[PDB]
Design a protein around this ligand. Structure first.
Ligand SMILES: CC(=O)N[C@@H]1[C@@H](O)[C@H](O)[C@@H](CO)O[C@H]1O
Ligand SMILES: *[C@@H]1O[C@H](CO)[C@@H](O)[C@H](O)[C@H]1NC(C)=O
Ligand SMILES: *[C@@H]1O[C@H](CO)[C@@H](O)[C@H](O)[C@H]1NC(C)=O
Lengths: 49, 49, 262, 49, 52, 98, 49, 104
């Protein structure tokens, strides 16, 4: 990910956890990132998990 | 996705509702009844004059 | 008889359409079959063909005549010279417009044939033909006697019922026989008394339309280098999907469908 | 598509027609002028069968 | 050897449910439906379908 | 029974086309690129590629829908009727009774 | 009485091809990778943000 | 493919008749199975035709007033290409690899 002096960075991630909580590692830091996820629309998709 | 609601039968008054999926943008729904017609099945018996 | 044929044959132009199996391989047949309807009961089918029935190449009423387009020239044949068969030989009942009423057995395809000069023109299409018995006895060949029951059959009348098909302005049909070659120069000689749009791409682009007698386009070296589309656009044609479309407003009238189910 | 009522008209003479037959256009064969399509067989004929 | 034109069956009508796919099939010719799971046991099915 | 109607393909040599909006029952339109149409009088276009063909289709009623059609009804509230010979005291009448 | 070919009856979603006879994209097993990376690509903590 | 004398012709069948060799154009020669067949070409002893499925094959022609016919009970097969079982080749579809008796 590109990094600037000050700001916000967006990262796209895929999880199977309904209540995810992981330790995202960046250049040196170890951020603790948590939240809540919700079931998706599609019952069936055309790509593997 | 199946949604269900109950709009009172009153012409000229809008009915606004919202569909909230677990992790998706809310969907606004509006129903505006301009006329509600009740048409009985009538069969002619006779004619008088 | 003359009143039915007014819009059908005052403005007629039979066409040549692609056939997937024409006596050798696939080609452009004069009798290409567009549709076969076999929803009637006693083995009566109504074909729609690129050729036309009941008049001569000039456009005057004739008894039993199949009229077909051959490379731009409208020609004739008697209707008894044409053969039809699905799995066994069929028996043509009548013809009218683009449509032909025949009595056919059941089959997985239908084939139409005729020989005019020396070669055999044929067209076979994979349209399933069905034989539908009437009643609760599943015969295959109609009985000689029994009891009369109501049924729906393709009638032997060509009167104007409520069903119509569209006639459209024909698209320009390319003819490569017009483009001949004088010494290192293409030359377009359109058919006598008929125009030809010569779309010709070589050094300098050429869209010369209004040629009537003969023109020599010496800028272009070989015949295959450019095309000479044939323009008549006086007799209108059915809205076939096996023909090119003419630009602009194309609809020009309605053709009544004969031999309707009755 | 493929079942009774795949095409629907309010009356015989009505100008409206609801059609749902999975009509799908396919690529034309090379060097051929025709319109190749694919659709479910008529539902009226199937119902009659 | 060469290339020849083979037909193209009507597109199946696919309905999705929880761990389920329902196929509605309307063939014009007797058409082969082949099926297999993408796992250690394919459990392949191979059917010829004429009627809807 | 339906009838799949369809317009004549619109062919453009060294060009491109766009789909007309659908206005007919089940109308489908597609512009197939890189076609080389080949009429009875030789090739149609002098243009190896970038030739376009617009093909569209739609559904109509068959020409025999006036006679060979099935009509769907909703039925309710049956109305019973009878045809009676009534004879009362040597007085007779044949009538329809609701 | 051939029965369907391997392209239709193979496990793990394998795709069978010929000339040469091969199976592609089998979703089975795991590839172990061994990396020998020169120190030139590595950057010190001071250089990186 | 060539006449009684031994010179190349367009489409000609050469046949032996009681010791003397005769010729007839190929468009007078017909053959059929359950349904009529269509001759594509001929060469030497061999004839390439387009035939539907049938349990036998018959070959006929007519010279003066006698019809020469020969019927043999050799099964004729129609082999669809792909996974859709058709009895007549479709007007459109998708191109698939097949093997056919080449017209050469
Ligand atoms: C050969 C011939 O008859 N040509 C005619 C002539 O009247 C003219 O060349 C044109 C009108 O522009 O119409 C066409
Ligand atoms: C399963 O098949 C039945 C009929 O066999 C059908 O009614 C049902 O809809 C199918 N399942 C789903 C999820 O559609
Ligand atoms: C009832 O009416 C029918 C019709 O006229 C007649 O045939 C029948 O004999 C009548 N019965 C009596 C008992 O009058």
């Amino acid at each position: 990910v590109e990094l600037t002096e000050q700001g916000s960075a967006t990262i796209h991630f895929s999880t199977a956890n309904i209540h995810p909580e992981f330790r995202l590692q960046i250049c040196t830091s170890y951020v603790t990132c948590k939240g809540d996820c919700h079931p998706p629309k599609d019952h069936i998709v055309t790509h593997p998990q | 996705y199946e949604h269900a609601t109950t709009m009172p039968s009153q012409a000229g008054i809008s009915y606004n509702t919202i569909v909230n999926r677990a992790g998706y943008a809310p969907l606004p729904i509006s129903i505006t009844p301009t006329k509600i017609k009740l048409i009985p099945t009538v069969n002619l018996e006779y004619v008088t004059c | 008889s003359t009143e039915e044929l007014f819009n059908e044959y005052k403005l007629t132009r039979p066409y040549m359409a692609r056939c997937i199996r024409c006596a050798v391989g696939s080609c452009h047949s004069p009798i290409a079959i567009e549709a076969v309807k076999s929803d009637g009961h006693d083995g009566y089918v109504r074909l729609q063909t690129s050729s036309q029935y009941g008049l001569d190449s000039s456009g005057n009423l004739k008894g039993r005549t199949m009229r077909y387009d051959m490379h731009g020239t409208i020609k004739e044949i008697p209707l008894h010279q044409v053969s039809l068969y699905t799995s066994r030989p069929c028996h043509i009942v009548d013809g009218h417009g683009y449509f032909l009423l025949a009595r056919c057995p059941a089959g997985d395809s239908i084939t139409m044939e005729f020989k005019k000069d020396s070669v055999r023109h044929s067209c076979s299409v994979p349209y399933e033909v069905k034989f539908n018995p009437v009643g609760r006895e599943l015969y295959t060949h109609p009985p000689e006697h029994g009891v009369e029951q109501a049924c729906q059959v393709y009638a032997h009348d060509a009167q104007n019922r409520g069903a119509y098909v569209e006639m459209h302005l024909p698209g320009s049909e390319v003819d490569s026989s017009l483009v001949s070659l004088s010494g290192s120069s293409v030359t377009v000689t359109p058919p006598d008394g008929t125009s030809a749009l010569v779309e010709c791409e070589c050094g300098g682009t050429k869209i010369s339309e209004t040629i009537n007698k003969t023109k020599q386009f010496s800028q272009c070296t070989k015949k295959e280098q450019c095309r000479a589309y044939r323009l008549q656009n006086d007799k209108w044609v059915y809205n076939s999907d096996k023909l090119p479309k003419a630009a602009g407003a194309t609809l020009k009238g309605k053709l009544h469908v004969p031999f309707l189910l009755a | 598509p493929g079942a009774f009522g795949d095409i629907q008209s309010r009356t015989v003479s009505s100008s409206d027609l609801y059609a749902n037959t999975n009509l799908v256009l396919q690529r034309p064969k090379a060097g051929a002028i025709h319109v190749p399509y694919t659709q479910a067989p008529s539902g009226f004929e199937q119902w009659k069968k | 050897d060469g290339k020849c034109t083979v037909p193209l069956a009507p597109e199946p009508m696919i309905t999705f449910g929880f761990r389920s796919v329902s196929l509605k099939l309307h063939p014009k010719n007797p058409t082969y439906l082949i099926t297999r799971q993408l796992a250690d046991e394919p459990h392949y099915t191979h059917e010829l379908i004429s009627e809807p | 029974h339906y009838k799949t109607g369809m317009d004549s393909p619109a062919i453009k040599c060294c060009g491109s086309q766009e789909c007309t909006p659908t206005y007919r029952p089940d109308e489908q339109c597609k512009v197939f690129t890189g076609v080389y149409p080949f009429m009875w009088g030789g090739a149609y276009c002098f243009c190896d590629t970038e030739n376009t063909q617009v093909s569209k289709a739609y559904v109509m009623k068959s020409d025999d829908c006036l006679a060979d059609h099935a009509e769907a009804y909703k039925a309710h509230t049956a109305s019973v009727q009878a045809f009676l010979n009534i004879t009362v005291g040597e007085h007779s009448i044949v009538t329809t009774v609701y | 009485d051939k029965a369907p070919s391997l392209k239709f009856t193979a496990p793990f979603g394998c795709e069978i091809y010929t000339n040469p006879i091969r199976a592609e994209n089998c979703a089975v097993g795991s590839i172990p990778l061994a990396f020998d990376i020169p120190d030139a690509l590595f950057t010190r903590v001071s250089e990186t943000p």
